[PDB]
Enzyme design. Structure first.
Site, PDB file in Angstrom:
ATOM      1  CB  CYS B 120      -0.950   0.004   1.203  1.00  5.05           C
ATOM      2  SG  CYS B 120      -2.152   1.341   1.141  1.00  5.05           S
ATOM      3  NE  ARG B 123       2.457   0.672   3.503  1.00  5.40           N
ATOM      4  CZ  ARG B 123       3.652   0.096   3.577  1.00  5.40           C
ATOM      5  NH1 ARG B 123       4.093  -0.376   4.739  1.00  5.40           N
ATOM      6  NH2 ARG B 123       4.406  -0.018   2.492  1.00  5.40           N
ATOM      7  CD1 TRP B 292      -7.039   8.930  -1.935  1.00  5.40           C
ATOM      8  CD2 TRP B 292      -8.039   9.146   0.060  1.00  5.40           C
ATOM      9  NE1 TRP B 292      -6.127   9.474  -1.061  1.00  5.40           N
ATOM     10  CE2 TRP B 292      -6.714   9.616   0.170  1.00  5.40           C
ATOM     11  CE3 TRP B 292      -8.867   9.181   1.190  1.00  5.40           C
ATOM     12  CZ2 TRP B 292      -6.193  10.116   1.366  1.00  5.40           C
ATOM     13  CZ3 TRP B 292      -8.350   9.682   2.385  1.00  5.40           C
ATOM     14  CH2 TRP B 292      -7.021  10.141   2.461  1.00  5.40           C
ATOM     15  CD  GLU B 297      -5.397   2.117  -6.671  1.00  3.14           C
ATOM     16  OE1 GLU B 297      -5.639   3.216  -6.109  1.00  3.14           O
ATOM     17  OE2 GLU B 297      -5.701   1.005  -6.167  1.00  3.14           O
TER      18      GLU B 297
HETATM   19  C1  HEM Z   1      -6.115   6.349   1.732  1.00  4.52           C
HETATM   20  C2  HEM Z   1      -5.939   5.968   0.434  1.00  4.52           C
HETATM   21  C3  HEM Z   1      -5.285   4.815  -0.007  1.00  4.52           C
HETATM   22  C4  HEM Z   1      -4.506   4.747  -1.116  1.00  4.52           C
HETATM   23  C5  HEM Z   1      -4.095   5.874  -2.036  1.00  4.52           C
HETATM   24  C6  HEM Z   1      -4.072   3.372  -1.260  1.00  4.52           C
HETATM   25  C7  HEM Z   1      -3.390   2.914  -2.382  1.00  4.52           C
HETATM   26  C8  HEM Z   1      -3.053   1.589  -2.598  1.00  4.52           C
HETATM   27  C9  HEM Z   1      -2.471   1.092  -3.819  1.00  4.52           C
HETATM   28  C10 HEM Z   1      -2.130   1.878  -5.084  1.00  4.52           C
HETATM   29  C11 HEM Z   1      -2.344  -0.246  -3.651  1.00  4.52           C
HETATM   30  C12 HEM Z   1      -1.920  -1.267  -4.704  1.00  4.52           C
HETATM   31  C13 HEM Z   1      -3.151  -1.346  -5.578  1.00  4.52           C
HETATM   32  C14 HEM Z   1      -3.064  -2.424  -6.618  1.00  4.52           C
HETATM   33  O1  HEM Z   1      -2.077  -2.431  -7.393  1.00  4.52           O
HETATM   34  O2  HEM Z   1      -3.994  -3.262  -6.662  1.00  4.52           O
HETATM   35  C15 HEM Z   1      -2.831  -0.575  -2.333  1.00  4.52           C
HETATM   36  C16 HEM Z   1      -2.817  -1.858  -1.789  1.00  4.52           C
HETATM   37  C17 HEM Z   1      -3.286  -2.175  -0.511  1.00  4.52           C
HETATM   38  N1  HEM Z   1      -3.821  -1.256   0.376  1.00  4.52           N
HETATM   39 FE1  HEM Z   1      -4.069   0.700   0.124  1.00  4.52          FE
HETATM   40  N2  HEM Z   1      -4.549   2.588  -0.237  1.00  4.52           N
HETATM   41  C18 HEM Z   1      -5.337   3.451   0.522  1.00  4.52           C
HETATM   42  C19 HEM Z   1      -6.078   3.045   1.669  1.00  4.52           C
HETATM   43  C20 HEM Z   1      -6.003   1.765   2.242  1.00  4.52           C
HETATM   44  C21 HEM Z   1      -6.671   1.383   3.467  1.00  4.52           C
HETATM   45  C22 HEM Z   1      -7.648   2.255   4.262  1.00  4.52           C
HETATM   46  C23 HEM Z   1      -6.238   0.131   3.794  1.00  4.52           C
HETATM   47  C24 HEM Z   1      -6.594  -0.664   4.899  1.00  4.52           C
HETATM   48  C25 HEM Z   1      -7.140  -0.296   6.093  1.00  4.52           C
HETATM   49  C26 HEM Z   1      -5.316  -0.258   2.735  1.00  4.52           C
HETATM   50  C27 HEM Z   1      -4.722  -1.512   2.634  1.00  4.52           C
HETATM   51  C28 HEM Z   1      -4.064  -2.003   1.505  1.00  4.52           C
HETATM   52  C29 HEM Z   1      -3.670  -3.399   1.323  1.00  4.52           C
HETATM   53  C30 HEM Z   1      -3.777  -4.533   2.351  1.00  4.52           C
HETATM   54  C31 HEM Z   1      -3.221  -3.504   0.061  1.00  4.52           C
HETATM   55  C32 HEM Z   1      -2.797  -4.751  -0.723  1.00  4.52           C
HETATM   56  C33 HEM Z   1      -3.953  -5.541  -1.326  1.00  4.52           C
HETATM   57  C34 HEM Z   1      -3.504  -6.513  -2.405  1.00  4.52           C
HETATM   58  O3  HEM Z   1      -2.457  -7.169  -2.223  1.00  4.52           O
HETATM   59  O4  HEM Z   1      -4.211  -6.628  -3.430  1.00  4.52           O
HETATM   60  N3  HEM Z   1      -5.176   0.750   1.765  1.00  4.52           N
HETATM   61  N4  HEM Z   1      -3.276   0.562  -1.674  1.00  4.52           N
HETATM   62  N1  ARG Z   2      -6.690   3.313  -3.685  1.00  2.00           N
HETATM   63  C1  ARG Z   2      -7.023   2.118  -3.218  1.00  2.00           C
HETATM   64  N2  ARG Z   2      -7.519   2.006  -1.991  1.00  2.00           N
HETATM   65  N3  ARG Z   2      -6.852   1.040  -3.978  1.00  2.00           N
HETATM   66  C2  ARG Z   2      -7.173  -0.327  -3.574  1.00  2.00           C
HETATM   67  C3  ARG Z   2      -7.048  -1.295  -4.740  1.00  2.00           C
HETATM   68  C4  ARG Z   2      -7.999  -0.876  -5.854  1.00  2.00           C
HETATM   69  C5  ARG Z   2      -7.713  -1.525  -7.207  1.00  2.00           C
HETATM   70  N4  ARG Z   2      -6.308  -1.248  -7.619  1.00  2.00           N
HETATM   71  C6  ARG Z   2      -8.671  -0.961  -8.253  1.00  2.00           C
HETATM   72  O1  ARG Z   2      -8.175  -0.295  -9.185  1.00  2.00           O
HETATM   73  O2  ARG Z   2      -9.894  -1.187  -8.132  1.00  2.00           O
END
Ligand code: HEM
Ligand code: ARG
Ligand code: HEM
Ligand code: ARG
Ligand code: CAC
Ligand code: CAC
Ligand code: ZN
Lengths: 414, 416
Positions: B120, B123, B292, B297
């Site tokens: 993520c 973070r 968000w 993405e």
């Molecule tokens: C606040 C805005 C957030 C942004 C911009 C963000 C962005 C991202 C991005 C770009 C990825 C990789 C996406 C992909 O390639 O599929 C990701 C993965 C992930 N995010 Fe976030 N995230 C956000 C909020 C969260 C929240 C609130 C949580 C959990 C409480 C979280 C947990 C994770 C986890 C566990 C993954 C990996 C999931 C996987 O392996 O498919 N994210 N996030």
């Molecule tokens: N900004 C995020 N919370 N992304 C979570 C994964 C979403 C996924 N990559 C999508 O395009 O649907």
């Protein structure tokens, strides 16, 4: 045991069985993955003042000789048996041995084939191998290097080549090319810490000046070579301008681009890596192929710690550099890469774009899957610095491991 | 020097050592022999449905580890409350085989899980997660209510707020609470007669499952899927999200006037719903979370991946580019415009979104905060670096150490 490798674009799966042939450890452990690290913490290549354990060297030697005879479908033959005896005999009596030119040629091609970070390995079988072990002075090194360049450049129709200088020997100094590439642009530190030229070449530029070079004051001044014969101070040699092919950068539709006065050399020739074959180490073995456009347009010209021309181009394009959301950087980068491709094609100099390159690598992966049951590959290096997911390799899982013959990093000679 | 991984940033030439990896108690897929860092799903974390109760000894150690983390976080490690809480956990497990978390412990654990997620890039916001406790939920219908409230609170009319809703944890022999959909909001993927797919190819299986379960399918390219919610030991139930609750954004380009004619769009709320939240050994099979979007993405992966909407060629043709040769960089040009369209449209609609430049700069700040706070930060390089313009962002030049810390989010097998 054997990793299941999947391609998420096609849904296909394969099993890498070749990784089992790995005898050298990487930096990763089950506790943590250090795959994104560029250089090894310990996987270096410690000095050679003393002879390597005969048992270890002997096993690496036998394995290599075994590899060589399999390649010529003569395994178990009488020649194979005699060759192994020759090697055993030489190691036992001298603590080392020597390769036959044919074996050296085979070994060089294999090292390239095994290089996990090279996206151009589909060409691995067409490598021109120059035997320069007959070299005994920096001056002789300079002559060989000049012939390598002439041959490899071939008037713009680049040909892959490697020149192999004398192997390392116990208690004796190494033959070394101090420069990281045979052709590089100087980097001059100026008054306020800034840098004119290539910031990556500051240190080497300074060493050259220190050793008697008269520095220029341009952004693209080709550096001289600092060649080192065993236990001797390095000697300075200026490359004949006519041997160094360069390409003026211009844009297919943006007339003002040429006014930026940008250019880049045609020959990418790494010269600071060590070639290891059958336990033997070649500390000076410069190799070259041809550029993939992203190396120049994206990394060399756009990296923040390199020429860093992104903003200038953005302004000439009259883009909104006020905010990141306008994606002005992404737009400029694409045009700069387009200019590189356009220019090299105009100057009739060999070059490959990242799309064509990655497509060829996928073919290579397939060829190697059938030929050896796998292919060591470093994802972070194979995927281009721009438009990653727009290329096929991005969606291909890869396994990275160390096979021998191999190209490895080595300490800087100073 | 220090006996920990040496991490370098090649842009700044700075160095740091990761000592936090020493706290990892779960092995990854790599070995000194070979690196398997690029594998999307390595048979490691994989929380395979473990029916029979978990070894009380293994659960206890995991539980004690977490309670220690909790008491350390509130600066009361070694206190009387800490040792008593430890006794209470060991006792509860002694007589029941499992245990339960206090409200504040759940909040702490959910935030740590996000904080610990190697993939993520968002973070830096970890501390501001809104944790909805839904451990009293007792039916699929109630799961729907909870989910609708989450969607309403998180969407907040375009000014998105990070949130997670935690349903009851897994219990011995008793079925799991599960959300079958991979995200709360997903577009249908309809298999065609000629073998092609209309809509999103990534959701063909879930779409077919919804149909097999009574959903009357549509025939559009962007039909929002219904939810298949499963309470313990019951077949999954089908629920249709009220359209007014699913905020979507029509896509248009700032200068290319024809882009709007393409009829493209995307939903505003990214809510992963098939991951398992593990805290001190306890397993929350249903705990959907959302933040968000980062623009790449949508614009690069969802819209341009060959196995997704694959709109690269259509847009290139509209831009009148030479798609017969790679050297024209037609894919690169179209990708940039599609990404710009996404950012422009979300901004226009006043819906929260972050571009890849802003996001990666913020992640660099996060890495620095974490270096000081915990001695490091587990990060998956291949997932952190954006799918387009990789080396134009600061993270590309930052070496990263990847490892598993708990609490954590993990993949789990599909319930069907
Ligand atoms: C606040 C805005 C957030 C942004 C911009 C963000 C962005 C991202 C991005 C770009 C990825 C990789 C996406 C992909 O390639 O599929 C990701 C993965 C992930 N995010 Fe976030 N995230 C956000 C909020 C969260 C929240 C609130 C949580 C959990 C409480 C979280 C947990 C994770 C986890 C566990 C993954 C990996 C999931 C996987 O392996 O498919 N994210 N996030
Ligand atoms: N900004 C995020 N919370 N992304 C979570 C994964 C979403 C996924 N990559 C999508 O395009 O649907
Ligand atoms: C023929 C055209 C060739 C192309 C298009 C090509 C392309 C590449 C690229 C893109 C990289 C990564 C560059 C970087 O990010 O710095 C690379 C690395 C490498 N290539 Fe090639 N290559 C070619 C020929 C060769 C040859 C002839 C050899 C050896 C005989 C070779 C050996 C290597 C090695 C060992 C590396 C890793 C170098 C390092 O760690 O810095 N390549 N190549
Ligand atoms: N295509 C090659 N042979 N590349 C070798 C490395 C060249 C290096 N990346 C440069 O920008 O100069
Ligand atoms: C071309 As403008 C400076
Ligand atoms: C612009 As459309 C074809
Ligand atoms: Zn690894």
């Amino acid at each position: 045991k054997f990793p299941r490798v999947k391609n998420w674009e096609l849904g296909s799966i394969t099993y890498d069985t070749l990784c089992a042939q790995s005898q050298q450890d990487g930096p990763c452990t089950p506790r943590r993955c250090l795959g994104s690290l560029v250089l090894p913490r310990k996987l270096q290549t410690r000095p050679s003042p003393g002879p390597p354990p005969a048992e270890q060297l002997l096993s690496q030697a036998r394995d290599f000789i075994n590899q060589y005879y399999s390649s010529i479908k003569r395994s178990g033959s009488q020649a194979h048996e005699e060759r192994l005896q020759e090697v055993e005999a030489e190691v036992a009596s001298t603590g080392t041995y020597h390769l036959r030119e044919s074996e050296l040629v085979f070994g060089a091609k294999q090292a390239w084939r095994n290089a996990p970070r090279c996206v151009g390995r589909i060409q691995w079988g067409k490598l021109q191998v120059f035997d320069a072990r007959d070299c005994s002075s920096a001056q002789e090194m300079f002559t060989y290097i000049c012939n390598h360049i002439k041959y490899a450049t071939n008037r713009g129709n680049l040909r892959s080549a490697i020149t192999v200088f004398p192997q390392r020997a116990p208690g004796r100094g190494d033959f070394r090319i101090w420069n990281s590439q045979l052709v590089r642009y100087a980097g001059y530190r100026q008054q306020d810490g800034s840098v004119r030229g290539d910031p990556a070449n500051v240190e080497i530029t300074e060493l050259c000046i220190q050793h008697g070079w008269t520095p220029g004051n341009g952004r693209f001044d080709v550096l001289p070579l600092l060649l080192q014969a065993p236990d001797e101070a390095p000697e300075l040699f200026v490359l004949p301008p006519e041997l160094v092919l360069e390409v003026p950068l211009e844009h297919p539709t943006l007339e003002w681009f040429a006014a930026l006065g940008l250019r880049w050399y045609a020959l990418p020739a790494v010269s600071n890596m060590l070639l290891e074959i059958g336990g033997l180490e070649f500390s000076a073995a410069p190799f070259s192929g041809w550029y993939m456009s992203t190396e120049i347009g994206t990394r060399n010209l756009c990296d923040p710690h390199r020429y860093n021309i992104l903003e200038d181009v953005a302004v000439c394009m009259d883009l909104d550099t006020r905010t990141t959301s306008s994606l002005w950087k992404d737009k400029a980068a694409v045009e700069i890469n387009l200019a590189v491709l356009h220019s090299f094609q105009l100057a009739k100099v060999t070059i490959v774009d990242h799309h064509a390159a990655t497509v060829s690598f996928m073919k290579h992966l397939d060829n190697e899957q059938k030929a050896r049951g796998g292919c060591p590959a470093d994802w972070a290096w194979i995927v281009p610095p721009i438009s990653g997911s727009l290329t096929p390799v991005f969606h291909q899982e890869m396994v990275n491991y160390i096979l021998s013959p191999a190209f490895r990093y080595q300490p800087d000679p100073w």
